[PDB]
């Protein structure tokens, strides 16, 4: 891919998932070298994120952390707008925070942690924006058992 | 004026003027005309005098 | 600051009502079943509710004092109240108040 | 188990009054009170906007005397407009109990009478406000035409004109209160100031 | 019975009960003598779980739901919800449907800017303009209520292969009447207001983001175009029937509340140009003329062609969106909406995620309150056009 | 065995040991143990359960269910 | 150094005085125009032709295919069929819709194949008891309100049904039409030259 | 005449079924309900548009079917007769039970005649039906106003 080969010469390898019915190409960066890829991309005129949030790839398989990038030139035409992915294992692990490279990862990563449990290493103020802070459960996982609260039971 | 018939509206003081519909139900002298049009079939009640049984 | 689970006909707080105030305490867990008198109560039913409240706060608690756990206790108390009302131990108030059957309408048990 | 969810079947029947003077004074007591309802300026979601359209010039509830109030201490009517999530349910009960006793409730929109379009597959919306506060009038419909909110106001005025000054006993709260010690490890609050002065905002960790 | 003053930074809770139109937002803000040290916005009081619902509803079952994320304009998010499976399936939308969609989106942008404009002018002045926008915002409600069933949100007028139904009969003429009656007033606003020196010094330099920091902080909306970035998703993505209309994407350069106000007013003014330019050029013109031509010769003629229908082929409620994810976008009133649909093989999507513009424009509330004043808090809140319905995801 | 909308019921314990129930809370609601668990989809190994309460469906696994 | 500051102060003060006088004149002018208030209880606003009000149900046309239950955002309409055994005909026993839970999106009315289900112009639903919002199969027909046929209401058209150039609908003659011609009229004119 | 005596209660006890004509602002008929309630009669208003046959809902039983929303397959409730159940739950010294119907305009002439006839039988049961109308709170027997 035009970006998959752009960081090829930078002496670091990433997979290639191809295009996604929109022209955007998807690469699967590894969880540990995420910051390096994000840095070499931010140096190569990728300064605008537009999306960060996760998604559960299967009811027990693993989570994902899909990032989105774009060049954002002024008065521009259709820009390259690459995206990346990070497959974090289900039970224990977590991914690094890209907030320091570019922001908008303050709340988007915060919401992904609130909805899926994905911890973000080196993220400032990792709390739950939605879903009151005393909650427990990561409610957007594919298998979340909602408590038997009275004000959620019915309108009998 | 009986149910099932296709009717038109003859009352210049009504928003449904010169509309055409089908009679769904008649009770107590007043009728209910269904205008199938746009997307959602509308049903509004007219007097027995503000209609005309179009052929 | 207070920590409370307030719904209709159940009001759990985290303090002690000395004369009408609340005064957060961190271990009192007051309870205020049916303040607005949606239902009519008896001496046996209120005792059953108090016993359920005690066995719910004491026998199952070694966890934090977050508002989540307070809501989790209030939900169980209100399910117990609804079960009491279904069995017929208590009933709606029928007084000249709002009279909206929040826990269900009267049915005939077929 | 003869009739589930039974009724009270009370005693001491009414102790109501009859003399023309006291019922004529009750007429004024109920006329002054229903024709000067002051709603609380309380909106949560979509329906609030229609409520605001009911304030605007196109048709204002200023006639039949409705002036929107900001604090609940002066408000005697709360038109609950919007979905009430479990995060904000105690923030409403408070505003309702923090508000003088001859007070009323209108549940507007489908999201405050049954839960609405969120009565299924939603894990945070309270499924109707009738399980938080004693609603007086229900008007259905995703955002109801602001001349349906006024129809609800008509149906609430004709309910207020029904009250009886010899009946204000059914207006206090009984307060059947109990007490039980616990052992539950109080935790520190995780919601304070310290958003930009936090030490983790100023420099990335090594 | 008192409050025991002491020399510390004072923390005040502008809690969920906002006696305004700025949703439910908590905003625990500390201050040192009429300043702002830092604020912690507590969002979430309206999280109803749209993302988990969307995974369990088919498309036509979910399309009434979408009109809630960002209430107002309840057709931008309808447009993006329709576009999401439409792009995967590659279903071609006719040109007449594209023109009706453009007209509806532009009327919605005008209504969005009016709803932002009312309480903004209220918070920096008098409460009469709140009674004037809702006199002017009703003329669009009464056009929607003719075209679609209801007023603003809960229209569900859009469909995958086009638009639920054609316009009413006397609709184009009446929209022309509204445009001619409204276009002078977007300037009458800047006549009666925007020149009070006390009012312009009020938002002269309060709130500010550099062009290079608005890109980093991802402020997609007019909050970007007020910081000197000529970039909107209508001209960069070539949204459906654009490049067919004249374009003046308004941008300021300073990046303050005044710049936001000016960009929003110029954008509201350009929307009327877009509407008046599209109305004179519908593929078929007014609907009564099109119906007359179709009943006069359109039994087989070109007026009964695919390009003149309000919809493509009507799809069953079991559409079964295909496999493969992609990210769709629309330049809404508050900026960019984004739906990261994935979908696997069936009617229910896989991870229907919503990317709302207000959720990202709100990230710099603390940065914009870096010691401005205690009084200009509400002005900076109104300069962002916060809608808590789009702060639920 | 478990198929086509049969009313299932999580057993008691194959659930809170499999390191795939660490999503929800440690406590478990009493609507899991009633014989009302209509199955709506089977992705080979896991199954989506409806649980007749107005809360989202649950993606459990056939190891954690019985036909009841 | 000090005279420029004073001339700027004067140019600001006189400007602030003129820009208050102008607003004062504008507001004092505003109180001559006729109020746009639609005085609801006696001046009800007649709804559009597509307004989505209470659902109407014709028990005789229903065939119990449950598409109303299937395209509903919340699967609301309760349909109770029994499937009689004459040859194959389903029998309807109870149709109902809890209008307290209803969303008024009219997907059910869009996909009814037999035109059994329709929308009305009844926006005046309100009760003291939400359990009275669950409409039986009989409480649903009930021949809708028809605001126009009310002896104590002066109906008022909305903006889309007022003649060309007309903005308000209060001081209106008794012979106004919507905006233009209907298709049949245009075709009839085109028929003659 | 700006203040009313007790003629309303006498007329209700005489006819049995009245048909109010309240003004469309709804704050001037509640006092007549209060007059009714002060005599000993107990009221219960139930907003006529939403009742069924008016014979299955008032006299007989009827199976209410709540809103299942994808869960909780169809179940019936069989709530008791809305009248025979409230005639048993009257206060000890109760003169009767009058039935208030707010939006009587939605009902039909057949249902009005039924409600009128139901007053003669079933002794302790009167009926008030707020048929919309006049600019003053005037009443008229419900046996009249039809045919
Ligand atoms: C420093 C010193 C200062 C001290 C302060 C002074 C305090 C003053 C306190 C008194 C103020 C009371 C004002 C009342 C005005 C009013 O009622 O509104 C007029 C309204 C208007 O509706 C009417 O109703 C009629 C229609 S209808 O039949 O009611 O439906 C019709 O007339 C029309 O609607 C309209 O006219 O009348 C009503 O709606 C019904 C309310 C009935 C009012 C009761 C009558 C008054 C009796 C007084 C008590 C006397 C006791 C002895 C009687 C036997
Ligand atoms: S009641 Fe309807 S319009 Fe109001 S917030 Fe809820 S869904 Fe939106
Ligand atoms: S009304 Fe239409 S959708 Fe509903 S059961 Fe009858 S045929 Fe099916
Ligand atoms: S109006 Fe909406 S919720 Fe009600 S039956 Fe129709 S589709 Fe279902």
From TrEMBL, chain B:
Which Gene Ontology biological process is one annotated for this entry? Answer: photosynthetic electron transport chain
Official protein name in the record = Tlr0636 protein
Source organism of this protein record: Thermosynechococcus vestitus (strain NIES-2133 / IAM M-273 / BP-1)
Q: Which residues of the full protein are shown?
A: 45 to 99 of 110
